[PDB]
Every structure is written in structure tokens, then in C-alpha cells.
Symmetry: D2
Amino acid sequence: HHHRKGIILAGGSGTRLHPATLAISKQLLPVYDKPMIYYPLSTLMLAGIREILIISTPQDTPRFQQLLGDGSNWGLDLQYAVQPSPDGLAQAFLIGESFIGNDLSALVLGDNLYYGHDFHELLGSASQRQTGASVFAYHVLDPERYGVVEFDQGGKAISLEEKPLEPKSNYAVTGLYFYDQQVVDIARDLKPSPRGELEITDVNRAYLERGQLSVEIMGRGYAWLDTGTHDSLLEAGQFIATLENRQGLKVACPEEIAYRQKWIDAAQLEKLAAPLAKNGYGQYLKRLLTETVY
Amino acid sequence: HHHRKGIILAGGSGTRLHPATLAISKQLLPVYDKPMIYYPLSTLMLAGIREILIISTPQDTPRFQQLLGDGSNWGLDLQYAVQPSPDGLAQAFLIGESFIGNDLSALVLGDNLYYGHDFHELLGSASQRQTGASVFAYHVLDPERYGVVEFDQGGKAISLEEKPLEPKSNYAVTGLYFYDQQVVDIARDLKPSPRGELEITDVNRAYLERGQLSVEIMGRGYAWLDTGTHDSLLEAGQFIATLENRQGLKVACPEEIAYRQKWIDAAQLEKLAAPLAKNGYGQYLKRLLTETVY
Amino acid sequence: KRKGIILAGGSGTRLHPATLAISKQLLPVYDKPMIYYPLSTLMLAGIREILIISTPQDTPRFQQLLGDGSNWGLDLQYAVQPSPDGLAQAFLIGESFIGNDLSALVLGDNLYYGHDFHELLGSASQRQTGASVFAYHVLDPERYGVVEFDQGGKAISLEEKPLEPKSNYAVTGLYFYDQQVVDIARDLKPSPRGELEITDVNRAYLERGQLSVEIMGRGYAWLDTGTHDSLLEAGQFIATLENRQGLKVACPEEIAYRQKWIDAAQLEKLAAPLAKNGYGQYLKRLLTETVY
Amino acid sequence: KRKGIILAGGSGTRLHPATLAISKQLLPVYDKPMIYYPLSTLMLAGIREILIISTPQDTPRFQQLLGDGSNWGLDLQYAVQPSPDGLAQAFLIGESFIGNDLSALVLGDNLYYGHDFHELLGSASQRQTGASVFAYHVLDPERYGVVEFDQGGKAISLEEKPLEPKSNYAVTGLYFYDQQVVDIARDLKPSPRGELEITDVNRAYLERGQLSVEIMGRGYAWLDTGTHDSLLEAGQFIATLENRQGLKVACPEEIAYRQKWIDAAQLEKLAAPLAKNGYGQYLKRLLTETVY
Ligand SMILES: CCCCn1c(N)c(N(C)S(=O)(=O)c2ccccc2)c(=O)[nH]c1=O
Ligand SMILES: CCCCn1c(N)c(N(C)S(=O)(=O)c2ccccc2)c(=O)[nH]c1=O
Ligand SMILES: CCCCn1c(N)c(N(C)S(=O)(=O)c2ccccc2)c(=O)[nH]c1=O
Ligand SMILES: CCCCn1c(N)c(N(C)S(=O)(=O)c2ccccc2)c(=O)[nH]c1=O
Ligand SMILES: [Cl-]
Ligand SMILES: [Cl-]
Ligand SMILES: [Cl-]
Ligand SMILES: [Cl-]
């Protein structure tokens, strides 16, 4: 008788971006002024998630651990798992099964950057849906590269296709997914696609066929940035730099997000600022203590 | 017995950006794939404003007229005035006095670019306030360069200062202003500041002292882009290019905004596409006829 | 004596609406009008007498920008190209300007940068007979005049926008000609696309073994201004060089002064109007600083 | 025989958190690890025997990346610098590697580009006595070793990060030395900031009239990797060159192959693992294409 956790998939991108990524995983590469993984981590945090599993290669887990620790500095609890071989995104749920337990979950890709107004509220809406799965659809130039969602005249999602040659719309599914307690069992019964991968689109189609997939539009006023190529990586750095140098505010500073969620107080933030007091990042953390930012 | 119009200030930026701007006004320079003036024009249009006065130098008015015409192609009515000498932003209301008549108004700077989610609704809120004046405050790195707003502990605006050496906050007033029928008379009684200029901050302080200035925060999730330097111009081009190449959607395409406001129909948009059918811009206009974009 | 021509004519509707109000070559690349860059190139090549060819609409604009040239030690003239009917029209339009002198054409939207560019130009300019062009390795040779070389490195063919390019070597927008070019241009027939082709002019020199094709090495930057994306990149490229160095690329006043076409007192007068911005400050600092 | 050293040591906490997980010199600049660029520079200078010096933590990472060098016709060795105690420590750490040979140090985060760079390096490398450095005009000379010249153009002083720089000419991160440098390094005292200064090594050669200071001209790009903004720019600069040209900057496999240190069949083996991305495709295309 019986009476939301986060996952960040930051494993191998294979040899796709070699030789740039020969010495280090993509998700530890900087995007402008901070490691890439700070952005998806900050995203889960904005969604109010505090218990988070980082999935990386066996080779780079210690590097993630060194950067991020156990989370206690930022009011989180961070755990780690390895993905020996990159057998697909849906594998996150088998690797993370004991971590998830009987809870709701959120999966984010470790190389996905988001930006925009009321992003907190867009994340809240998905996080509040305690049943079913929630994903986001975003208009892209190149829907071929993604899971593509087709809508009917009423705006209802009626199909999902993984990397179709002739996409039914320009609406790609973003690398951010919210799931109720059915996801582990759905993942467990997945059979490898032709490429040997356990596909997240198959997971989302399972929910769709059950009438339990909410697809919310992430509007054109949001930036969902591309890190798939060297070119798009560079554009992602330039995009963040322009916003931060314009505003005097950072995007996805995890210390700041914890501070504003009240997961850490002013004294704790002051201590985090000390080691970096001579660079712009530590000076930014110090300015958060006295400035009112709306 | 007696029983909202837009202005775009696109006059002289002086010799500040010479020699780049020796042959042509700044507001006709491209930002990535379209003239700069398309962005503030699109902004007024998003606010639902259809009667718009463009203020330029006598030298470049014909160039604006050639680019934009009388508005009829886009469901607008565009008129023109000249600013013989750049005697300040508040001069817009004396130059535009007969154009404004007895109506409410909106002033936008011809070199200001905005971007973000629910921008339409942020513009709507200001446009709906039929009394008083409405402005926007945005957090910037360099508030010294702008009109700066100071808030009290409750978030109420309590002072405005033009280019203070020691800014009371990092909140700059953006170059977008909504005004009731009192603005022309307020402008008329302005005395030149020490620099010989008729200051918009003095106009906004007049409303503030009357308790009729609404200052809404434009959040950090919006991009209010800088075009003040060659560097910031270049960053503005890069910023737009990244969004448009990512999305397959344009920012501030005026034809598109008219189409979506129902100011022009599909047949009219088809005709606008014809002359540019061989380039990306005309091909974009054609794709708007058949695609559903949420 | 070698005369210069800059062809800054119409690029059609390809970059519209960005270029609806104004010719591309009057638009800035970072901190200065695009035409400063090819103008600076002719000046570096030692050319002082220069004809600028533009659309009828925009010739007043180039004129008010650049003047008769005298304040920079140049002698500038202007002419119009009514319609975009081929780069070779420059020699028809420019026939009486050229007269019996040597000539050099540069395209108004072409940007160059690199070490010893002066000597690369100086060598081509010194060759008093035949014609000299430059071949540059590019990713997309179909867009250009493509030069094919034999195993010995000799140029053996030229094709204008081939469907199947023979190499990745594009001819750049910089051409030096002897006294034969006008007469060769006058006998050109329009191509199938309806243009008087510069590549037909160059093939005429090639058939007589009088086309010197120099490699512009990979250490030189020949930047692309043909698309919006490429305009932007060119701006970022110049900005990175100038902000790194504290030195400008293709500042005509500097080049005049370094060629000794204007003296210290004239450079000082030029600085006066712009004194309150970076460009005039730059010009002032060139008076007292030794730059190697 | 001239030996090479690359100093790819710790840059402290200056770029943290971006460099918290990994040394800057193992981070990409556009399409390849930053250290490919100074490695490619030594190889272009003709240097095959090369010592890479890094933090104790990251030496395994440079090792697994670069191997013993044999697949690129190089002979690579590795050594650690326990603490960031000055660039001159390279010659102490590298003393037994150098032995009685000539040497050249390049900083692991310095990027160069330009025409005839090979000959600029080749000339310095050929000078068998004394030391050769390069002076480059920059906007912010206070950040560097600043060289002052007399009216005749002779170097007369060197200052490390002067408060009031004497010129705008910075010494770049590329240094060639004769057999004297180790012994000069061994006698260095720590500076006031607590470091063994490369500028004190260079001043020692200067006092004996044995410092050749060559101008690296404004036609060369010496790119800045010291700030986040400057990392980004360097990436945009390399991307613009490579996408324009269809040719890569500082591809070590290409440089080996062009120096004839590996043959056509070895380059082909190298291409195999990367065949499905741009980098391996590039290597394959170098087999059949003549590039001048
Ligand atoms: C709850 C505090 C939100 C303020 N905020 C913010 N809106 C942002 N954004 C710009 S964001 O909501 O779009 C965002 C937040 C986390 C990760 C990526 C974007 C941010 O990066 N950091 C912040 O502290
Ligand atoms: C009413 C149709 C709005 C859709 N839209 C849009 N949201 C935008 N934006 C990205 S925006 O609301 O931020 C905007 C609109 C006009 C000018 C600048 C930004 C746009 O540029 N063009 C559009 O057609
Ligand atoms: C005779 C003056 C040469 C120095 N020089 C120079 N080399 C350059 N170059 C960087 S350049 O030779 O590559 C060049 C010159 C004119 C136009 C484009 C590039 C320059 O822009 N301005 C200069 O004064
Ligand atoms: C002997 C091979 C020289 C051709 N070359 C070259 N010039 C360059 N350059 C662009 S470079 O000389 O300026 C250079 C070379 C190594 C590292 C940095 C720049 C190159 O990157 N790769 C090459 O194969
Ligand atoms: Cl939106
Ligand atoms: Cl916001
Ligand atoms: Cl070269
Ligand atoms: Cl040079």
C-alpha cells in the first residue's frame, strides 16, 4: 500500500564538431562569458527545479563536477550519471530512472540556449501541468533537422515527425521537455530507430497518441539559439554578448537566478562573489546585492 | 462650440557618425536586410498607428519619400515634414503641430530598434492610456547617455534626469513615447537647454510633475538595441541576422505587419511581392500568403 | 601615367529594400563609406587622376561626398552609367577620360587587405604593356570570372560564371590595362545575359599571351560585399582590425599624406571638421605619430 | 636545429567561469582548438621538435589531443608549469629539452595571419645568433611589452606594461632565441609583480645589441584572445576568412603536408576518422587540389 526533478543531457555529440571538441565536451565550451551548460541549468532553475541530474560521458563527468559541485553553493542538489555510449536522448530516462523515482520530471538538452520576456511564466505553465507531457514548438528556417509538429486548422497538434525530408510545418520541437510519471515506462518500451538511437520524438508521439501532449508555441519574440555548428556557436556568443553589453545584465547567471528565487540569501551570494572579485563576473555578483532590478 | 497619430524623428544625427553618414542619413542605413527606419515604422504599426509623420532633413526627405511613398501600399497614410536644423527631439511636436491637430500621439526615434515577446501587448498597454504620457524604462550598462528614471522603494517613478554624470539608476527611457493632447502646449513653452536643444526629458518631467507620467518597465527579456556608434550599429545588424536566419522569419517587415493587422489583404501582399520576387525579401512576402505563423 | 576608374554602378534589386534609397557603394562598411576602400586602393597603387562612374541618380551623392579630389591631392571626375549593362562599359563611358594613357579599373564594392598590398599593386601598375589581373581562391567560384591554370601554373582559360567551374580561383575586382583596352571594349558584343563582359576584355589579352594573372595569396583578404550576410562580415572584419590596431584600413586622408600628396598642414585642416569624433581624432594623431 | 616551445599555461581566474573547467588554449577558435594556431605557426617556421608546456591538470588533455606528433611528422614532448610565475619560466622548464640547440617560444593563445608570414618566420628562424622578436601597432600598448624606437627606427627601450607607454608598439607572443636564452633565464630575478619576465630576457639581448626587433606590419593580423569579447572576434575573423576562401587557417595537417613532412597516403589516413564532417572533407580535398 502506497500513501519535479530535472535532467540535463550533456553527453557526447560524437565526432560531429571534431577537432574543436576533441579535448572537451561541447557543453563545457563557453558561450561568450560562461560555460554552455550554465544556460540550460539556469533554465531548469527558472522553472523552479532544484534537484537536477547531469548526464555526461565518463571522460568529462569530473569536469562537470569540478565546475558545478553538488549544487549546495546555489541552493540546488546536483547529482551525476554517465552515458557510456550516445544511444539517444530518450536514454536519459533509463539512465536517470532511480534518480527520477516516482516524481515528475523535466529533460533539457545541455546545448540549448533560450532567451525572452516572460520566459519564467512560459516555463511555469508547462511545469504546472502535472499530468501528460509538455513541449515547445518554435518556428525555424530548417525544420528538417528537428522533430517537427504539424497542426490542424484549429491549431491542434496532430502529428510529430523526426527529421522529415518534407516538413509539414516550420515548427520544431525545442530541447526542453516536461513529463509526468509515465515517461520512464514509455522510454523502457522504446525500440531503437534505424540509427540505433532511442528517440525522444517516439516518447512525445506516445503521449500524443494518448491525448496527453500539450504543445505550446514559443513565439518568435523568444530566441531559441542554435549551437549545432561552429557558425551557430559563434552567433550564439555574439547574441549573448550584445544583450549583456547593452543591458549590464547577464543571461543565465546561475548565482543570480538562485538569488532571485530566494534559494540563496545576500550573505551567501557575497561569499560566491569573493573568489571572482577581480573579474567582471564576480563584480556582477556583487552589484546584485545592492541594485534593484525589475 | 466643439462636439492616435505617429511621428518618426529621422533627422540629422549631426556630424557624429561622419564620414560614414556623409552621403546619407543614418535612418536610411541598413540594419542587416532592411533600412533602419523600417524598424521604428514597424513599431508604430504594431501599436496600431496608421497615420504617421516622418520628420527628416530637407536634403533626405525625397529619399524617405522614395522608399516609403504615401503609405497606401501598406494601408497607412504617411506624411512628411522637414527639420531644417536639429534643435532637439521635443521640436517634433512644433514641427508636427498641424499634423497632430487635436489627437493623441506617439513619438518614436527613427534609429531605435526593439524586439521581444508580447511587444504588441506592451505597446497596446501604453496606447490604451488615453490620458497622460507613457514611456518605457530599460536597464542599460551606460545610463549616463540617456534620460534616466529614479524609482522609490515601491517602484514609483520620482525623478527624471537627462544624461546625469551619476545616474540614480541603470534605467534609461527608451526612444518611444505616447502622449495625450497636452504635449504640443508643453513643447511650446519649453526653453532651450544649455546645448540649444528642446529636450524630451523636460516634456516627460512636465507630465511627471502633473502626476500623469506612466513609466512601464521594458524587461530584460526585450532587446532595445543601440545604434549610436559604428560598433553598436554592426552589433544591431548581427543581432537581427541571427534571429532571422534562425527562424526563417523577419523582424520589422512592414508588409508583414500590415498584412497581420488586416490593413492589407492577400492580393495586395501578392502585388507587393512581385517586384522583389527574385530576392529573399520578395520570396519572404510570398511565403506569408500560404504559411500559418503563430 | 595611369588613370583610375571606379565603377560604383547599380546592383539592381538584389539587395532591395536595403539599397532602395541609396547605392550600395555609398553605404558604410564599419566607419566609412564603402567607396573609400576601392578609392584607397587606387591611391595606394599610386593613381591620382580618377573617374567615378555611378547611376545617374547617385552621381550628385558621390560628387558631394568626394568633391573634385583637390583636398586629398587627387583630381576626381565623374560620369554616369544609365543602365547595368556590364563592367566593360566602364571603358566606353571612360574613353575620353582615359585618352591615350594607361588605366586601372576597380569595382566600387570590393574590399582588400593585406601585407605588402602596396607592392602587389605597384608591380601590376609598373607593367606598362598588356593587362594584369589577380586570381584569389574562393569557396564559390561560379559567382565570378574563373581562371583555369595548366600543371605549370600558366593561365589557359577564363570563364564568366561557369556552371562547372574549372578551378576555385576567381578574378578579383581590380584590373590594370595598357592602351589597348578601350579599342577591345569598343568591339565587344553583348553576352547571352545581355552584358558587355569584363571577362571578354581579359580573354582578349589572354589569347595574345598578354594577360598577367597574379595569385592574390590566402594571406590577403578579398572580402565579399555581395549579400547582406557578407556586408555584415566585412564590417566585423574591418572593426576587429581597427580596434585591435588603433589604425584604420583605407583612410584616404592617411594614404594621401603617406604618399606625400598633401602636407602636414593640409592634413590638419582636414581634421578640423571631424575633431569631436573618432575619425578626426585619428587624423590628428597621424600628425605626431610614426607608424611603420 | 631550432627547437619549439608552446607555453599554454594558466591564465588564472581572469576568464572564469568560462575557463573554470578547461584551459583557454584547449578551447576552440571557430573550427579547431586554440593551440592549433601557435602549433601551426611553429610548423610554418619549419620547427618539428616541439615542447608543449601546460598546467599540471591539463597536460593529459594536450597529450591526448596532440599525441607524440608522429602522425603529423612532428616530435612532440610535454612538460608542466606548476604555477603562473612568468613566461620566462619556459626556458627553465624547457632547459633539458632545448639542450644546446636554437629555440623559439610562442604563446599558446596567440593567433597570427597574413601574406608572406612564412618568410617573416623563415627570416627570424635563419638568424642563428642573437634573438628576434616582432613589434605590432596596437590600441592598448600598456597591456604588453612596449618597444620604444629612436628617430632612426632603432629599438632603444623595452618596458613591461608601462603606466605611460613610450609608443603603441607591442612585442608579440613569438620569440626566437640563440643558445644564450637558458643561461639568461637562469639568472633572472622575479619582477615586482612576482614573475620571471620574458621582457627581462629580451632586454638582456637589447643591452648587448643582439635584439632584432622586426615590425609586424598592419597588413598582418595579430588577434587578441585576452578577453571574452576578443575571443569572440577572433572566432568571427577566422570564420570570415575560411568561409570566403574555402581554405582553412592554421590546419596543422595541411601545413605538415605542404612542408612535405607527411605524404599523400598519410594525409589520406588522417582524413578517414573525420570524413563525415567539414574538417575531414577539407583534408580529403587537399589531396587533389592545387592551391597556390
Ligand atoms: C526570476 C528572475 C528572472 C530574471 N532573469 C531573467 N529574466 C533572465 N532572462 C533573460 S530569461 O528569463 O530569458 C532566462 C533565464 C534563464 C536562462 C535563460 C534565459 C535571466 O537570464 N536571468 C535573470 O535573473
Ligand atoms: C501582429 C503580428 C506580430 C508578429 N510579428 C512580431 N511579433 C514581430 N516581432 C519580432 S516584434 O513584435 O518584437 C516587433 C514588431 C515590430 C517591430 C519590431 C519588433 C515582428 O517583427 N513581425 C511580426 O509580424
Ligand atoms: C602607403 C601607406 C601604406 C600603409 N597603409 C596600409 N598598409 C593599409 N592597409 C591596411 S592596406 O595596404 O592593406 C590597404 C590600403 C588601402 C586600401 C585597402 C587596404 C591602409 O589601410 N592604410 C595605410 O596607410
Ligand atoms: C607552407 C604552407 C603555407 C600556406 N598556408 C598559409 N599561408 C596559411 N596562412 C593563412 S598563414 O601563413 O597566414 C598562417 C599559417 C599558420 C598559422 C597561422 C597563419 C595557413 O593557414 N595554412 C597554409 O597552409
Ligand atoms: Cl512572440
Ligand atoms: Cl522580461
Ligand atoms: Cl599568402
Ligand atoms: Cl604591412
